Design a binder for this molecule. Sequence first.
Ligand SMILES: *[C@@H]1O[C@H](CO)[C@@H](O)[C@H](O)[C@H]1NC(C)=O
Ligand SMILES: *[C@@H]1O[C@H](CO)[C@@H](O)[C@H](O)[C@H]1NC(C)=O
Ligand SMILES: *[C@@H]1O[C@H](CO)[C@@H](O)[C@H](O)[C@H]1NC(C)=O
Ligand SMILES: *[C@@H]1O[C@H](CO)[C@@H](O)[C@H](O)[C@H]1NC(C)=O
Ligand SMILES: *[C@@H]1O[C@H](CO)[C@@H](O)[C@H](O)[C@H]1NC(C)=O
Ligand SMILES: CN1CCC[C@H]1c1cccnc1
Ligand SMILES: CN1CCC[C@H]1c1cccnc1
Ligand code: NA
Lengths: 363, 363, 358, 358, 358
Amino acid sequence: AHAEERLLKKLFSGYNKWSRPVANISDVVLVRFGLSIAQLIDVDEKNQMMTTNVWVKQEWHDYKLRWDPADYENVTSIRIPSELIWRPDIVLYNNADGDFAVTHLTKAHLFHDGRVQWTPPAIYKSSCSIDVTFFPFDQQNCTMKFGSWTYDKAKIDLVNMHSRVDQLDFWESGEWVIVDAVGTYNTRKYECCAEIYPDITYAFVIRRLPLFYTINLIIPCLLISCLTVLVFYLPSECGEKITLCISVLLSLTVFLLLITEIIPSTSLVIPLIGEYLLFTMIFVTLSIVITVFVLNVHHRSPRTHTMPTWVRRVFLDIVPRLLLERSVKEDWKYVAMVIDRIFLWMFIIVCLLGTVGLFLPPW
Amino acid sequence: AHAEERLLKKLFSGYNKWSRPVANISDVVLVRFGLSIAQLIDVDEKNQMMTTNVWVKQEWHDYKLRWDPADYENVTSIRIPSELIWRPDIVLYNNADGDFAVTHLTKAHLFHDGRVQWTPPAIYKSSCSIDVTFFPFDQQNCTMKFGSWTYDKAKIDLVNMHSRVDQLDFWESGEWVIVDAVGTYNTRKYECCAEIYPDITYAFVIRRLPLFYTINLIIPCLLISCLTVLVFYLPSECGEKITLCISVLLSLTVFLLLITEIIPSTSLVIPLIGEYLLFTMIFVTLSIVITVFVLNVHHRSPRTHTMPTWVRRVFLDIVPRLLLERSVKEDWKYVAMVIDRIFLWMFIIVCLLGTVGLFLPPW
Amino acid sequence: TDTEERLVEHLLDPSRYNKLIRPATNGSELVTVQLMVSLAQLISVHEREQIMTTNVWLTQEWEDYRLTWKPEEFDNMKKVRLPSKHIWLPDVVLYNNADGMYEVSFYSNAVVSYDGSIFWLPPAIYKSACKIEVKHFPFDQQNCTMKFRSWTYDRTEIDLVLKSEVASLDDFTPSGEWDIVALPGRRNENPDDSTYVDITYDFIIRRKPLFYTINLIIPCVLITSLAILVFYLPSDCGEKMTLCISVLLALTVFLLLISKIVPPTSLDVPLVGKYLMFTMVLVTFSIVTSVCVLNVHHRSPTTHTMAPWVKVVFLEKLPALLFSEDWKYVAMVIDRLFLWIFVFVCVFGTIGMFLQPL
Amino acid sequence: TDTEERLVEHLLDPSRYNKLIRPATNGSELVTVQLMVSLAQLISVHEREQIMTTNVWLTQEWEDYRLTWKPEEFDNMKKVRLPSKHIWLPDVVLYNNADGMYEVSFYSNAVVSYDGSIFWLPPAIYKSACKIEVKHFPFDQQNCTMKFRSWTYDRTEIDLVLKSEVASLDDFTPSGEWDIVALPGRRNENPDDSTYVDITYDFIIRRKPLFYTINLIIPCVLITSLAILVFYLPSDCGEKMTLCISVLLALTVFLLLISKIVPPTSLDVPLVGKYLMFTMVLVTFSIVTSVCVLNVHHRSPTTHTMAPWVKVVFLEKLPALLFSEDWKYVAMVIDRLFLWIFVFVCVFGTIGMFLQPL
Amino acid sequence: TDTEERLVEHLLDPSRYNKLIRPATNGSELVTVQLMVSLAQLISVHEREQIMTTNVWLTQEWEDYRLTWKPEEFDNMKKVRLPSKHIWLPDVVLYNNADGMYEVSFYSNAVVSYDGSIFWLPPAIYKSACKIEVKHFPFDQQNCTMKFRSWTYDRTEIDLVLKSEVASLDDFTPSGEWDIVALPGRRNENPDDSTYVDITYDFIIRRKPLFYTINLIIPCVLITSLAILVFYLPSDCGEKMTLCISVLLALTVFLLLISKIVPPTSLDVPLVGKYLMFTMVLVTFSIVTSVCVLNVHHRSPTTHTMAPWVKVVFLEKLPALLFSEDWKYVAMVIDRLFLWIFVFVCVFGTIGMFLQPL
Ligand SMILES: *[C@@H]1O[C@H](CO)[C@@H](O)[C@H](O)[C@H]1NC(C)=O
Ligand SMILES: *[C@@H]1O[C@H](CO)[C@@H](O)[C@H](O)[C@H]1NC(C)=O
Ligand SMILES: *[C@@H]1O[C@H](CO)[C@@H](O)[C@H](O)[C@H]1NC(C)=O
Ligand SMILES: *[C@@H]1O[C@H](CO)[C@@H](O)[C@H](O)[C@H]1NC(C)=O
Ligand SMILES: *[C@@H]1O[C@H](CO)[C@@H](O)[C@H](O)[C@H]1NC(C)=O
Ligand SMILES: CN1CCC[C@H]1c1cccnc1
Ligand SMILES: CN1CCC[C@H]1c1cccnc1
Ligand code: NA
């Protein structure tokens, strides 16, 4: 204990924190990287921002921080506050809405040979581009760029202690499951600057467990988007022909709108279900225009053209073609019924073609 | 001025900040409390949290900070940064989502006899239980526990400079008016620990000026809850009998729902207006079920039972009892009209009984 | 610069200077500080939260006998910059803080002249609280304040002076919702428990209404007209209910939308809301009469049809207004009776509404 | 006090004390620290955000040979308070942080006895993360944890001990949404890359359901009943559509309202939501049959009216159920057929729903 | 490294260096600083809040005679890194801050060459305020600025220079909503109370419209078409009201949705909103005529049916348009009259609308 203090005296007698600590001037520091994820918290899609809890395992060495354990009662690994020791400036290139790195500055171990091990915690707000297509079954590649800042490859080079990210103390609980977590070592010239500057880009591949949004988003809008064709079958004379249409269109727009306030509002790709709910709306609006065109001609018989070649097109030609006062009024009663069934065929045909176009990727 | 510096030299020549400063070991420090509220800001009911702006007038004494004013050109009260002087650890027991105390650490006066006056500002987030019943005419008792932490009654005892909280520099502007603000001196043993630890509990009694929520919440939902009975009077054959029902129920649920996102979601008491809007909904839903039961039997006459003892119950017995193809169909026309008026009597009777139960407290 | 290194050393070497102690020649004598405030931009006026967020440079001026020097003595230096934290400064601070940073936020260096005069202007952002008088929405003038005062010294050891009544708009980005109408500043003197000096700046800001004039007023004005129209529609459509319900809820929606923009205060009622509410009342009472009409309309068998009541409506009221089909008629008339009432009351009501702001 | 000034000086004068170094007599010997945790109040259980906010005093106890003294030597002092920042303390910290402050909030002074034993209890507010098991809403019991561990020392130089299994509810404001059911604490031991000690407190809290029982369950229970009622209504009103659409959207609204209260997890489905969803499915399939009924109803000219289909419905199904007017009849019957189906399925469904929690 | 320990000691040992004092050879002579700004990514363009959040490295360059050394003297060292906090640096800062951190975020080490030239580039995230010109939504080009200036020194003791007109996009993640169209930077000179130097960077960003082109424009374009369709529908359905109300509220909803995306400014009206509002006006005036039609339709007993008004509509307008059943006819015609008007006005209006952006 007294020895432990006296050890600190001798270490920090004349020790420079601001010195790049290697024996030779040319010789480099090897800094090793072990990324230990504590928990994945928020994956805010709309902001394209991921909030992670991370330990950044950093190992390096000082020839100046060596001692003889036998000289000091076999003390071999002393813990010393990081603030006093020289420390590499490991930072996040990819930070948004957060401090770049190492805010906490926790204590680090020193081994008697002068190697130093530092595993401080920190909260990082990574900014990854969010590809929304196959919502909600989507795989996202979210990266965290860890590099030095002021030191080039000549003076600092980074080493992967694992290619995989350490998940041993991970907080399993989330709406996500980690598909695989990958560490890539890269080097680059940055145009501002002269030298080559290395980095480690850590790519988290994450898959959304869809069962939540499957229930509360997809099932209802399928239940709702069913009723688009159903309007046609309803008889004109009930007076509810449009009341169903308006409900479908608006209810759809609510779900599209609700979805859009959850998507990142990017123009990279169209959110697949959004494109679906869009084309559904286009058909529904089209369905409303025709459904009003059905009712207009349907009711009135006095002072009506009722050209035969068109009533023959409808009653005599098309009626079997699709199957395979009262005199005029009921002529219209059927004519509307046929313009009806014709479009019911149209929509129920094209609907399935649209959904086949929706399932073309799994096909 | 030169004297003023030289005074500081002599004070802080050998002055210990970390010393509990009294002449005798047994003798205590008397710390005086004047609570000056600057403004009441947020009284977030949903979180049960009050945000206040406060000055904490703390007075005590040091035998070590005495001097002769005549010795130094009649300087008698010098202002010194609090950080250098010993300072009592006055803290809020009742804090939520905030620093416990004395973040700013502003300057304090020293009188030549050694007494020290400290009036630093700070923002406190008190956590008071919110009793929501008579919304919005509600009085809330919100408290702020100010006590020492490490020093027991033996070493620190607290004194009220006023029982009332100082409101002389208060920011009148709010939706609240202070009913009365009370300071209570208490002492207790805390179970962790051996000794007696005093506190001052400051109880703010606040009343909501209701005129806002009176307009935008209470008046419309009364205007809306009118229409519950009105459904019955509408004739069946208009076809709007349910369109009024659905609008009432949904409009009510919106107001209940809106109210609930404003209430603290506690299970202590039922929010009175919420319970009202609930029972209204129960009556309305009941009104929808019956008004559909009215329409079902009403229309059809072929192949109908039309048992006499029931049609005689309705047309011949009840019609005066409540007052004090066509042959069958119009029999039904009246029978529905009577099942109707019977329930209109039911609802308009019970409605007023419910509201009499609502106004039993002001009665 | 090399001489600057010397000059600074003399002035800040603590043997000469104790920051902790105010500089005045006599303890009798008081220090005067000059305070002028500069807008760089007015950022946010959150009405709901009753908060003004501004970014501000506040020019603080005073003199220290401790910090004088002869220019001849040190390479003819007229002026030197010094770190504010190391020299003494009057602890001038906002006393108007909502969630406040009481002092300035980033502590610029101070410009010091050879005669010992000090020029300081730190930037800060400030979150001032002002009562928001919401009546004539959105054409409303908000008098919003901010108190500056030394939180340490009273009117004994320090005194406060304005360099100008109006605040400086020198480097102001004009583009707000708001127009700066006037920006005066007053010096106040009153005794509390101890004597103190108040400097208060009044920001008088006029909202450019065009936005809420479009997307709030015009639609509810559009929908309020709908209210009276409901009657004209004949019972036999059935749609007398649909149109009547549609108007009410639209108005409540807009009332609630306004409610969550306006501050939740009970100081006064937003004129728009008061209007929107009173018409809402009129439509709810419209809704009950529309129902009353329909029950009069749709049944003739075993009906009273009391002659003196049919005469009053068909025979007496119809010409008074103009100057089972009879059952349909009495419905049409009891309708058009209330229509005449509503058209008068609505216009009389808006005339009463607009009488107040005029 | 004057002697306190002396005593403090001896103990903290760095020549005697190096805070940076743990005190144990032998490097062989380990320091043991006692940890007991006190609730002052449970503040928030944010289910959406999967976060417990509590305010907590954690009593930390250990002994330092460096900080002993003789009472006779210094005016019979038994106990002295010292600023925690200046003395050595085991860096005990939460390993359960969501957006976490890892260490405590106040850094209270530490009470030190003459034998060198230290008593520390700082206040903090803590934002613990726990997986929220949302099934039986709102009657749900959440086992929510919080790990305490020395983030610096391992099970070599420091060892951790409980003063109690149950956490202290000593000064607890009981008034939450939540009831404290049990509050045990365990000591865990496992080897990772290095050996470590875990102290874990389990907060088991039962939600008082009355609020959501009123303002969530009762309304959707009210509206779910409406679903079956839609059939009874005769086609000739026209209102078979209105009532049918109105029910569906109300249910989706409540489903979505629940969705944004529940955490967005896929661990399990909220029982209420599962029920609300399955009935929602039943009403959407109700909606299609209601339309199918109406097209059968409203047209007789040039209609199939195929006898074996009219016989099955009018002649065969009608007594089976009970025990152009014919067209209206077939509509009435194909209706009441599904009504019998829905009444059975609905009750069978709720019986199946409630079978699971029972 | 061991020699670095020596070199650093000489340069930072305060006897040689006073950070508090700027280095120039003569006080006459001015220090020039070179400023170039690098985008790493453009993060957020909050239109409502009128705020650009960017992360930025700003390359700061200048020279210190204090920090020279001979390489021969110290193991041929060309360049040494030093902690920025310990050396002097020009207090260069944003003057464009909304809720601003005025200085940078990391305080990186500075690269110093043997000749005394300093290379500094700290990372920061910046919350710049720019007026948002919202007209041609969503195809809008936003000129958003940020002022850099020394908040301490004026154009006397420090002068500012650009290393480039265009800002460096060197390590830029391209994936925004936004396209970088141009990125120039200007040097400005004007005298206020004191002479100052402004460096201003103009970010010109074009919104990729595809998102709002889909999920905002297309739906309201869909619903705006519905407006004219309302007439075609015959009175005898009853549904002339339903369809008419449904269109209005849908449009107001979309107007309000846009309103809370756009900044609440009155500088100008969003073209989309202006269009959505003017069509909204047209549908509200559609709503009243639809009612006027229905009362003309549904009653013939004791009706005026004044011949010169029946002749004008049945006999005169009908061929002009084409080139109690009569009562139904006059309804049909007074309808189709306004329909012809609305189709022309709508297309003429959209032609007038689209004429302006073209
Ligand atoms: C993830 O993204 C990075 C760059 O963003 C890319 O280099 C890497 O290859 C990707 N990895 C996977 C598994 O997609
Ligand atoms: C206020 O509340 C406290 C505790 O909630 C209670 O003990 C006290 O009696 C109350 N005081 C008044 C004036 O209501
Ligand atoms: C503005 O505000 C203050 C306090 O509200 C008031 O005292 C002052 O008279 C007002 N002045 C003007 C010009 O409105
Ligand atoms: C609480 O939580 C943990 C993990 O679920 C479990 O191991 C522990 O046994 C539980 N404690 C009790 C008392 O239920
Ligand atoms: C950009 O912005 C400012 C102010 O909006 C303007 O003065 C400047 O000329 C603009 N620059 C360009 C290149 O458009
Ligand atoms: C590696 N950093 C990121 C981009 C610039 C580069 C750099 C180079 C020298 C000093 N600091 C930073
Ligand atoms: C007064 N505090 C509140 C509860 C514990 C007590 C206490 C006692 C000694 C040191 N710190 C705190
Ligand atoms: Na509706």
